[PDB]
Design a protein around this ligand. Structure first.
Ligand SMILES: [Mn+2]
Ligand SMILES: [Mn+2]
Ligand SMILES: [Mn+2]
Ligand SMILES: [Mn+2]
Ligand SMILES: [Mn+2]
Ligand SMILES: [Mn+2]
Ligand SMILES: [Mn+2]
Ligand SMILES: [Mn+2]
Lengths: 386, 386, 386, 386
């Protein structure tokens, strides 16, 4: 009955089930969880692995000794459970020093500190077996127009990413980078606010092959965009290195609900696309159990993330395998969208009278697309009402 | 008193002052304007030139004879007034045949027709002296998930743009292309919905040098994004080939108000950036005088577009030239944002103890950025309250 | 298999299935439908009745003779099919005369014309057996601040509604009024933009008992509000006289998709509330089949509206009847929300030491609400995955 | 040069200049300010008074002794500076006990505690001379549909407000209540989400005369609504008891920028309306100096709030006094909007052939409203470019 197993590749950040519930208007409602405990509880629920920011695992300001101790305990829990660590990232947003950014702070000294903190964590990530290193520039941006010259900030962001690429290359590490966009919050506007802006920026780096995107459901939805469409563009470009799954109810603060909550039809189309395209990376959940819940509610919320993905996978698979759907797809000319417009070439197109001089515009215009019937088949499959 | 002249490079689409006022819920409130009349009236107000879609100038379905007649009359009005035609574009959205798109319609025959209609208008544009050809794919998109496989639609959109590039190259034309993004309306979601998504797509075309963006104030604002920030990224990439200026009041239907209306502080920061970066293309207005107005109100609205740009230019120039502002910019470390983070190189950074081991995080964190004082100077300059 | 019957009280506006597909950027894609044909087709699909604006039934400018002829033909189709007409409304938005509003136009003569056109249609509505008369003030509003003094416009809107109430009372008609809010489109901002603003305005009319609201799913969603919450406030006030069902994908132009499309979880909670509260009015659909469709697609879209309501009704009923859900509701203290806070009275509350002096705040704070488990039960029921 | 004085009635919450800078993603960047220090600094800048939540003045959990000490120190600073305390409110959102709400928590015991905490602070407010007591129900709402039955929650919210009214009446206090709406954040959806919903709810209380609204600029803007329009409806109803002034950049998290930031044209129209209507309550600022600033930046931000109001007041006054504007207002028929539609009565309207039978619809439709010229005069006045 929709039971996950390590083979489904479900992963969770330590900061997700570990969120204590502090919000802009309130104090924590839950005590802090030890990372060893989260690993054990997640393994029992059927997850494949966990991810972390540097500061989730090693308290900021830790001595070298304390650091070694925290890592050793964590590595023991991984060995005991069989859990993996497929991705890691850096906290460049909590401490007051990062109030104006990490890579793009106006103060040069802060920029140099941000790169050193990042490099230290790349070494750790490699040691633990991570394949992807994410960067979410949550403090890179502004609340007012004069505060940041965006051209100079993009020069600084390029310079930081180029140096990180030089580092991994020189060390011979087998790790790639993934930038995670977000349009706003905590800054008034954040730089590289969507998947499109991040894809475009990557093409100006020195070694573009090392970088991809880590899109998050709720972030593109904070800009009112279609998440499955943005993911299709990232797959088309060959840059979907990792993904963050959650839920969001429209354009407002970043809710981070469990996956399946928020826009349920967009979750269906997302799973349809990931499974059809054969995405083989982790199915990672960046969510926050609501502050109304106790620990029992934390684990129920985490289990619901995986359950919802498995129900949707079943429904999308049933939709694509139904002969009546296959027929409707041809009725709506999805097979013709996949054929080249003009494999014959430009000259042939130019000489083809059927393409212009003798094209019957009225006959073509009268042809219904039959999209509503197709979408009702998709609705019936989602609801299990076939 | 803020009087424009042809030297200010102000341009208008024929469809702007010529909008009859038909909306989703109502009939036209104004009669149609002859293109010759719009040219004469615009020249008297101090504009530099006009732009057009194919169907604005030559009624759809026109015979070759009728076509020649419409062009001749238009060329006479240009000669009489000294007006130029710096940009042209194609209508691939009004006629029912384009109900599912032009370049990405599911029907292959429609796709071939869309390319032939486009090519015919490129020839005309060159004849009239246009330097930029815009493409706004208003019907490229969907209302439901199953209707369009986005990967196949991006293959089709790439194929269309590649063929157009082959055409201009083979003909030896001196024209470049600019894609205009929009997130939604008239389709539920439109492909390449923002400046970022369009920049990323260009990098996958066969001859990327021929293509840039034509961003529009109100379109990025329909996604709640910061317009000046998106323009700074387009300038950074060297792709701001043209721009569409107007106003919009937040996330809702595309209003196309006159420039200066809507978000007035964003208009200030936009003019600040265009003038500082030395953008030298046309200052084009894609706006609609509200359907409440008669002809007198049409021309008042058009004149207000240019007046508002000139007032803002004066205020931004006064802001940048004020010694007290120059001092505040240094107080907020804008001069340090423009210096390289690590011109010393990676190894030097790695060996620098002042960047990590001996960096005083608390001292750096306590430093105020003094952004509020700077933003109040910007406010006083905008309001002429210095 | 989810087959509707006249007993389900499904109704449709003539303008819904009859929308020809003209949008802000394109021409009609379908021919006009005769009202007699729509009545027959709807009856075959299992609808209960239709609704109309004056201008949908009688072409604007019709002579008295032509008017009588249009009504007679329509009454014959109703008799032939058994369809009813439970609601009617007035078109005060299409004709250019209403460009600045009907009831709140700045020109006094237009205001008087708007009331006379309305009164003429109230008489017709009564003749046809309508019980509710809707008013949607789509042109009441503004694009700029100085154009409308809102206090004076609310005086004018009150004056119009008071006169209509005096008319129905003097004639002894058994009809009530329902105001339909919308936040924007076609005006920049519309007056009484949400269900809350309309409820508040009704309390200032001379005979408040005659007026209620006609909320529409997609309109409250254009303001990013929770539709089921707004409907619960209208039911609490005893003012839900009628409802408009459809779908909308967030904050953008008014899409009017078929019911069930858009926010599917909000559609579930809406049906849950209407059926639990025992709403007994019409289940009316104000939707537009997309312009991509031919006539076959029109009727498929209309049938999907009713199918989706019946699937959701089944799922909501199964949720409320499940013993495991009833248990979860008590676990989350929904039974305690329904009990009075202080039936004991103010003095007793003041004297109760358990309410303050001896209240254990920490013990109460530690209690989880168990909302995530309850919401996952709701998800499983919606998806038929119990 | 736009210097405020106590006569301008500017007020600030202790929590505004006192915000330490903790956000959903970061730690505090400033130390806590003693309330006595804020009073002194505000008085030097020209403010009239301050406001507070219970917990801003008396740390939660304080003994009776500690409480008396905190009040005495505060009363001394008021005496020393001449500052007044025109409004007070209750914190029913920070402590974990309020995680599901105060007045509408599902647990009955929490509801009774919320009322007792409120009553204790009403007594204090009266002692300090407050005339208005605000209620912002920031935790009243939900993240999921099943968690809260909205009808029962509105019964509970009515019961709480009725008990508070009984309390003030029985004590003979001269204080009125003002409810402050907000659409979301920190809850997924908050009950009474806009000014309209709060106005409608007041009409169902036992003694409606005791309650009004406290609207906040940025909250209505989080729903994409027009703030000046909502304020005009509150003034029309006679319910604008207090106001919260700040700035917000569209639909996103609640920014609380300084007044004048965000939507500058909406700030102009707001000041125009408050001064024309003769609003005589406090001009209160609920804002947060950005976490990028040190203490110097805090006071600069606070001073900019008052400066911006005074510049806008001057510009709005100049607009209304300009003979050319007075002429444009008549050209746009603002004088006719203020005249009754039908002071002649219903029968006279019914018998008036000029209102329908002989009304020339085409002539009336051709009349331009001349709104664009009027809005450009408003723009020139705002910018000081007359
Ligand atoms: Mn997020
Ligand atoms: Mn994330
Ligand atoms: Mn536009
Ligand atoms: Mn444009
Ligand atoms: Mn609608
Ligand atoms: Mn409707
Ligand atoms: Mn706020
Ligand atoms: Mn407030």
């Amino acid at each position: 009955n929709y039971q996950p197993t390590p083979e489904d590749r479900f992963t969770f950040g330590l900061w997700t089930v570990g969120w204590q519930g502090r919000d802009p208007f309130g104090d924590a409602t839950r005590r802090a969880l030890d990372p060893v405990e989260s690993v054990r509880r997640l393994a029992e629920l059927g997850a494949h692995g966990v991810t972390f920011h540097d500061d989730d695992l090693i308290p900021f300001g830790s001595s070298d000794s304390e650091r070694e101790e925290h890592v050793k305990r964590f590595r023991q829990a991984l060995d005991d459970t069989g859990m993996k660590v497929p991705m890691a990232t850096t906290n460049l947003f909590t401490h007051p020093v990062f109030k104006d950014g990490g890579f793009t702070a106006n103060d040069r000294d802060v920029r140099r500190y941000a790169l050193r903190k990042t490099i230290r964590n790349i070494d750790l990530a490699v040691e633990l077996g991570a394949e992807t290193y994410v960067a979410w520039g949550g403090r890179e941006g502004a609340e007012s127009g004069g505060a940041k010259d965006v051209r100079d900030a993009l020069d600084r962001m390029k310079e930081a990413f180029d140096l990180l690429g030089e580092y991994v290359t020189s060390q011979g590490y087998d790790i790639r980078f993934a930038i995670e966009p977000k349009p706003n919050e905590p800054r008034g506007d954040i730089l590289l606010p969507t998947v499109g802006h991040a894809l475009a920026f990557i093409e100006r780096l020195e070694r573009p092959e090392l970088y991809g995107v880590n899109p998050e459901v709720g972030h593109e939805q904070m800009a009112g965009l279609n998440f499955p469409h943005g993911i299709a563009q990232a797959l088309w470009a060959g840059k979907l290195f990792h993904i963050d799954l959650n839920g969001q109810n429209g354009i407002k603060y970043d809710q981070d609900l469990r996956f399946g909550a928020g826009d349920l039809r967009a979750a269906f189309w997302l799973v349809d696309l990931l499974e059809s395209a054969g995405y083989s990376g982790p199915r990672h959940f960046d969510f926050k159990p609501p502050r109304t819940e106790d620990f029992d509610g934390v684990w129920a919320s985490a289990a619901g993330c995986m359950r919802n993905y498995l129900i949707l996978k079943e429904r999308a698979a049933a939709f694509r395998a139904d002969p009546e759907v296959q027929e409707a797809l041809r009725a709506s000319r999805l097979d013709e969208l996949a054929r080249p417009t003009a494999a014959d070439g430009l000259q042939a197109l130019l000489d083809d009278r059927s393409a212009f001089e003798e094209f019957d515009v009225d006959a073509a215009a009268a042809r219904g697309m039959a999209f509503e019937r197709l979408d009702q088949l998709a609705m019936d499959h989602l609801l299990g009402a076939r």
